[PDB]
Amino acid sequence: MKQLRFGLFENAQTNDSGTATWRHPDNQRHLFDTLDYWRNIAQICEDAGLDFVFLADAWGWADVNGERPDICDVEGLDLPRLDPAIVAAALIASTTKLGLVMTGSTLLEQPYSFARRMASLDHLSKGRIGWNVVTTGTAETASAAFGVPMVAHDDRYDMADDFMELVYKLWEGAWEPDALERDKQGRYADPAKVHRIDHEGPYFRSNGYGNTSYSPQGTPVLFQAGSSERGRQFGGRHGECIFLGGAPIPKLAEQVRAIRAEAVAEGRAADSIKLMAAFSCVIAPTHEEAVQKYQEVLDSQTPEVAVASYAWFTGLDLSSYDPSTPMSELHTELSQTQVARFAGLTVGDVLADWHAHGVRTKPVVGTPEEVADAIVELAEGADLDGFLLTPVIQPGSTIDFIEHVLPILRERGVAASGYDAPTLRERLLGTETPVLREDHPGAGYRA
Amino acid sequence: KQLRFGLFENAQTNDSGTATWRHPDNQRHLFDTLDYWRNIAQICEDAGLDFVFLADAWGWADVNGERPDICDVEGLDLPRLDPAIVAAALIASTTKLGLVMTGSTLLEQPYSFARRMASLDHLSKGRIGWNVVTTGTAETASAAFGVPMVAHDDRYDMADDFMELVYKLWEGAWEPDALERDKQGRYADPAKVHRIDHEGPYFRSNGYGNTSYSPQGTPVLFQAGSSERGRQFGGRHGECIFLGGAPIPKLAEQVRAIRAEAVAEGRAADSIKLMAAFSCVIAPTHEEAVQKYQEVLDSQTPEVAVASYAWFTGLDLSSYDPSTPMSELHTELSQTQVARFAGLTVGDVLADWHAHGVRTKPVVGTPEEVADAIVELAEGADLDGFLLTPVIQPGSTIDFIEHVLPILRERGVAASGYDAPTLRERLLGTETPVLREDHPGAGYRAQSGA
Ligand SMILES: Cc1cc2nc3c(=O)[nH]c(=O)nc-3n(C[C@H](O)[C@H](O)[C@H](O)COP(=O)(O)O)c2cc1C
Ligand SMILES: Cc1cc2nc3c(=O)[nH]c(=O)nc-3n(C[C@H](O)[C@H](O)[C@H](O)COP(=O)(O)O)c2cc1C
Numbered sequence A: 001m002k003q004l005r006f007g008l009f010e011n012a013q014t015n016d017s018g019t020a021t022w023r024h025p026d027n028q029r030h031l032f033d034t035l036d037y038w039r040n041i042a043q044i045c046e047d048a049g050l051d052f053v054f055l056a057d058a059w060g061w062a063d064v065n066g067e068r069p070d071i072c073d074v075e076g077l078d079l080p081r082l083d084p085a086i087v088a089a090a091l092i093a094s095t096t097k098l099g100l101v102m103t104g105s106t107l108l109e110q111p112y113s114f115a116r117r118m119a120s121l122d123h124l125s126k127g128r129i130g131w132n133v134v135t136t137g138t139a140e141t142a143s144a145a146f147g148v149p150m151v152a153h154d155d156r157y158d159m160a161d162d163f164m165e166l167v168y169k170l171w172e173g174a175w176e177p178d179a180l181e182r183d184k185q186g187r188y189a190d191p192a193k194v195h196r197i198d199h200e201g202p203y204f205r206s207n208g209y210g211n212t213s214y215s216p217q218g219t220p221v222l223f224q225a226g227s228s229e230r231g232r233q234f235g236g237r238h239g240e241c242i243f244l245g246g247a248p249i250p251k252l253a254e255q256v257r258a259i260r261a262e263a264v265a266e267g268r269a270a271d272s273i274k275l276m277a278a279f280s281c282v283i284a285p286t287h288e289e290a291v292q293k294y295q296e297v298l299d300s301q302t303p304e305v306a307v308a309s310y311a312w313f314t315g316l317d318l319s320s321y322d323p324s325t326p327m328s329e330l331h332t333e334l335s336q337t338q339v340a341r342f343a344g345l346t347v348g349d350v351l352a353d354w355h356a357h358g359v360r361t362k363p364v365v366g367t368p369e370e371v372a373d374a375i376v377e378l379a380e381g382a383d384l385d386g387f388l389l390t391p392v393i394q395p396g397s398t399i400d401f402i403e404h405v406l407p408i409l410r411e412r413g414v415a416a417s418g419y420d421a422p423t424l425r426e427r428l429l430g431t432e433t434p435v436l437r438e439d440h441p442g443a444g445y446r447a
Numbered sequence B: 001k002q003l004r005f006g007l008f009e010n011a012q013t014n015d016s017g018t019a020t021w022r023h024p025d026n027q028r029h030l031f032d033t034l035d036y037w038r039n040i041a042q043i044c045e046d047a048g049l050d051f052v053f054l055a056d057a058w059g060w061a062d063v064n065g066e067r068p069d070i071c072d073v074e075g076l077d078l079p080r081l082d083p084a085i086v087a088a089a090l091i092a093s094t095t096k097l098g099l100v101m102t103g104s105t106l107l108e109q110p111y112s113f114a115r116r117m118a119s120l121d122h123l124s125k126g127r128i129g130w131n132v133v134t135t136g137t138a139e140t141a142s143a144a145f146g147v148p149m150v151a152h153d154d155r156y157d158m159a160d161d162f163m164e165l166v167y168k169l170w171e172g173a174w175e176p177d178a179l180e181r182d183k184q185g186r187y188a189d190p191a192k193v194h195r196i197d198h199e200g201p202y203f204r205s206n207g208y209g210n211t212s213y214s215p216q217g218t219p220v221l222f223q224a225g226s227s228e229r230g231r232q233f234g235g236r237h238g239e240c241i242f243l244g245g246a247p248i249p250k251l252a253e254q255v256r257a258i259r260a261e262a263v264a265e266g267r268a269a270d271s272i273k274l275m276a277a278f279s280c281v282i283a284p285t286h287e288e289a290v291q292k293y294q295e296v297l298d299s300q301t302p303e304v305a306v307a308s309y310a311w312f313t314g315l316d317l318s319s320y321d322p323s324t325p326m327s328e329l330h331t332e333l334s335q336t337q338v339a340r341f342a343g344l345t346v347g348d349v350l351a352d353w354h355a356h357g358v359r360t361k362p363v364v365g366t367p368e369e370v371a372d373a374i375v376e377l378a379e380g381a382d383l384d385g386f387l388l389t390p391v392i393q394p395g396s397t398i399d400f401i402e403h404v405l406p407i408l409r410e411r412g413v414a415a416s417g418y419d420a421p422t423l424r425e426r427l428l429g430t431e432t433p434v435l436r437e438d439h440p441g442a443g444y445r446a447q448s449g450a
Helices: A037-050 A069-074 A084-092 A111-125 A139-146 A151-171 A229-238 A249-265 A286-301 A301-314 A335-341 A347-357 A367-383 A396-411 A424-429 A441-445 B034-047 B083-091 B110-124 B136-145 B152-172 B228-238 B248-264 B285-300 B304-313 B326-332 B335-338 B346-356 B368-382 B394-408 B421-426 B441-445
Strands: A003-011 A054-056 A100-103 A129-134 A197-200 A205-208 A222-224 A243-244 A275-281 A280-284 A364-366 A384-388 B004-010 B051-055 B100-105 B126-135 B196-199 B204-207 B218-223 B242-243 B273-278 B280-282 B363-366 B385-388
Touching: A003 A037, A003 A275, A037 A054, A037 A084, A037 A396, A037 B110, A054 A084, A054 B136, A054 B242, A069 A243, A084 A111, A100 A111, A100 A222, A100 A229, A100 A335, A100 B421, A111 A129, A111 A151, A111 B034, A111 B083, A111 B136, A129 A424, A139 B204, A151 A197, A151 A229, A151 B346, A205 B083, A222 A229, A222 A364, A222 A424, A229 A249, A229 A441, A243 A249, A243 B218, A249 A275, A249 A367, A249 B051, A249 B304, A275 A367, A280 A286, A280 A367, A280 A396, A280 B242, A286 A364, A301 B363, A347 B083, A347 B368, A364 A367, A367 A384, A367 A396, A384 A396, A384 B218, A396 B421, A424 B126, B004 B034, B034 B051, B034 B083, B034 B394, B051 B126, B083 B100, B100 B110, B110 B152, B126 B248, B126 B421, B152 B204, B152 B228, B152 B441, B218 B421, B228 B248, B242 B248, B248 B273, B248 B368, B273 B368, B280 B285, B280 B368, B280 B441, B285 B363, B304 B346, B326 B335, B326 B346, B363 B368, B368 B385, B368 B394, B385 B394
Parallel strands: A003 A054, A003 A384, A054 A100, A100 A129, A129 A222, A222 A243, A243 A275, A275 A384, A280 A364, B004 B051, B004 B385, B051 B100, B100 B126, B126 B218, B218 B242, B242 B273, B273 B385, B280 B363
Antiparallel strands: A197 A205, B196 B204
16 A cells, blocks of 8 residues: 655645635634744644645735735735744754745745755754745735846746756755764865855856755755646656645546656656645534534635635636626636636636635545545545645644544555654655655756 | 843854864864754853854855865864754744844845744744844855855945845834734734835835734844944944954944944934953863863864965965064055054964954953953943853853853842843843834834834
């Protein structure tokens, strides 16, 4: 049996994904800016043996023509947030084995300082760091915030390739793994193992030494989730663990086959890339109890939010249209035969499903046995290597999965019983060594 | 007058042109382990020190245009860790200790720097400080980032623009009570959340800030520029100014000039705090302290001094007989350097450099002698505290805490412990955690004036 890995999707802000369940009485996400919130989440995850916590990030915000509507602040749709690298570092200090994965942007980070920061996390954590490589999902606002011009979608990925090449040189080529000797009767470092790098790319330039010596993993575990044609090529080249949003099993299976074919086209083994699907659930001892439990979180969300956030995430201002109007009865846009995928849905239908989960994956709602069976049928049907648990409320959604579903998966032998490897790469990739595989591009920048 | 005490640290093994890492009691070769930092922070927090300060650098040694092998054999310059990451890890290990980190206005981007510092301030409940630098490793650091070099005085003009932008983000973007998080009312009050607009010579920003108003608003601002332009910048923005060691009459003049600069910027002379770097070597008798210091100096490889002197000054003295008067090298010296070296030989210069690099010269003696030196400095130069710069770690810090700090507390010149939750309250001696109204950053508050 393939043993699935599990990570927890989190972000350093109250609400996410176009939903706003922060008003639910048991939701603690409004305390995201306190260290106690994060210490508790991490302890829950580490005591359960979850492989990692993943901190999503964004730099921009939801806006309509340069302005956030009141609702953004009355319901905390987007802002405020914290920086994930700072949260990750704080969590290092209260964990020993839990993996820590953070989003970091190739569009807005400077590679030289970013490489030093990530390698610092990797040193202090003893090799537990991952990096979710993003360009931007909020390109308009994030660019204005940093004072830089727009970069079009595919050019963002060419910039990301150049970024990756430089950070690979800094992580893998600047200091050999054994450069540091720290012998008070010998050498501090072997001068033959410390190298100047030289990089002249279309977007970035660097000439000189790297600040950080070779870290326990070398390069953080690389996560990536792009679904465009160009983003799929980028993930096929660099990504070690690829995230997928929820989809019906047959569609997910085809996407998995496509992503593994992109890795093969870049010279990598098909099984050397790990696929993890977002997965949400609401668990209760009976099916009806779960439905009511899910219902109570849905009822906690203000009804005006659904229309507001659907607008931003898609562009369709639906406040006007009566809920009985078929979607296909509207224009706005979409490329004909795509409009047929709507298959005669009504505005009410879309907003009700959007109210339910936004861009988060549709939760599996049922008993522990029902949720466990869903996980297994997803993993087997789509050839997945793990799941990214996306909570509907914190910490309850995580606690429920840990206390009721994970033990079933463990008894069935589909989930490991605990931490068997000390670095994140060894744990997620099954590698023997904590460092990149030889068929990964970053390995080609080693001395 | 209650003196404040901070610990000067950096996230690398050696610093300041010296290299005492081979001393049997030095543990700084473990700088890249969390356990080293956990231990330092506990030692400091248990003693009630006001803060730990993390220096930083981005560049490396450049001796005759190359990086010679001795830089790696002795770990003179590299490797290092990022101080924001060390600081964040130390947040989670401490509850009251202040954490001050260096951050460069030349190389950081202000929008993400503002968010990073405000995140540290939120998570720490207001215990963060920022030592504002314009990089000192400018040449090599610029090449690493791929950017053109910027002149000394231009760096301070860029720094003024950087400060204006981060003040808008920290003080002007979210009012202090914008967040209500009332599950029956509003998450945030939309009238208290503001777009910023900034169009400066070096930086541009248009939009909202990522982080809401943090417990101190703006981190406590530390600064250490000693040039004329750097003193002007400190007098405008710095809340705590760090001075290197010097004889009492010289420190007193520097303190006087910095306070006059603050007054000219519209601030109260006493609202800026002056802290001197202070090093010491402590033993139970004077003679034992002298010998202890000799054993520190003997731990440094003899070949280091001439190589690190060349790194810091550009002057390679390795080919000269040590009896050579510096005056004979005038073709390689500016007029100011010739005057400063007058009477000195190459051997004098390298002997002095071997003993302490650019670190302050230690007071060497008994605990009573060191305590007396601290009081004399503070009274004679009008200082508000001291930045303890260790010669070896953790020994230098432990010696001071165990033997000198109790004397200072008995004499009533150092506080018993922590009776202020934020770093600004503790260091400025105020009940208010946010910038004073006569500070430039306060003018960006939307609260009555935007
Ligand atoms: C599970 C998951 C997590 C994601 N997290 C982030 C994130 O933290 N920041 C971000 O900008 N985008 C995030 N995304 C969006 C993707 O990075 C990506 O941009 C999107 O799938 C569209 O693909 P494309 O970039 O190739 O157009 C996430 C996507 C998924 C499926
Ligand atoms: C106690 C002390 C600590 C310093 N720490 C740093 C540091 O961490 N990083 C840095 O680039 N410069 C550091 N400096 C150098 C000063 O910031 C400054 O550049 C130097 O004093 C020269 O002054 P000027 O910039 O006005 O010419 C420090 C100086 C002192 C006295």
